Amino acid sequence: KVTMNDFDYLKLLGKGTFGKVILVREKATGRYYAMKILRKEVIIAKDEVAHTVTESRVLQNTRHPFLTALKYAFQTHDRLCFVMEYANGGELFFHLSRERVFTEERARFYGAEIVSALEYLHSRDVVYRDIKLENLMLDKDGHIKITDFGLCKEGISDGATMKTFCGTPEYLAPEVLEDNDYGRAVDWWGLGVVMYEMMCGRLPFYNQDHERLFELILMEEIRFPRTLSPEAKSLLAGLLKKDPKQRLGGGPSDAKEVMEHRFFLSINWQDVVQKKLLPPFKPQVTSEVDTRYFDDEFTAQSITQEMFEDFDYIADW
């Protein structure tokens, strides 16, 4: 049994409407982790138990170099805790906001690692549904670590469908903004939005009002900077195709279509998964408690069953 007192609570890494992520240190080992804390009362009241259990299950049953791994998963009388591996390098959102735009080669590196992770998730019958810059982290070496498995759906093989209206507004696929069901191709749209942000310096569609934003995602055509390479324009047009059946990765071969696109011609896919490629940026952290790659809005803040049966976990590593 793992308790709350087995850890030291240092500083806040991130905060959402439904949870907090704190940098913790295990007293017995001296090792640093990121603990996601969720309140049971908020989850039960909003009827989000199924999604929270799935988040734990996906974290328990996944093992990939570009996916954040789970060390422990425990619960108290009022809280649910996920003890994950700490991504020292912060969000891709932090780096892109600072640098405004990435080179096509830098975006290709991150893109290749995200494709590798999504191929793995899809092979395990899992659809991620929340690809966004805030959910894409960098580890101490500069490799991608996908975090936040809160909206994942299990048991989705081949052309199987999902019905839950969920995701992040600015990243929603056109088919999700339509009635009825949708397939796994929503993850490729998400990849398209992050690749667009990395290479063009902005979201493909934006408006502060959700109603106007949804109209843009469904009706507006994407624009490209004149200087963007033809292979990058082709990748973005393919990943951001409104019809999931016409989308790159939307066909029966899924990830293979994205992997074989001319934009990724220079990529050896086995070298990607085996971490053989040199990262275009290595986080300049001086210690394991150095949070220079996390926003000051969060780090400066002070930090003072039968239903959840498939929640608990202790890792083999």
């Binding site: 409407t17 959102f93 906001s97 909206l151 209206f165 969920c166 992040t168 507004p169 990243y171 902005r202």
Partner: peptide, 10 residues
């Protein structure tokens, strides 16, 4: 600039 984006579930 683009502000932080949050997820939702109906």
């Amino acid at each position: 600039g683009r502000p932080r984006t949050t997820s939702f579930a109906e």
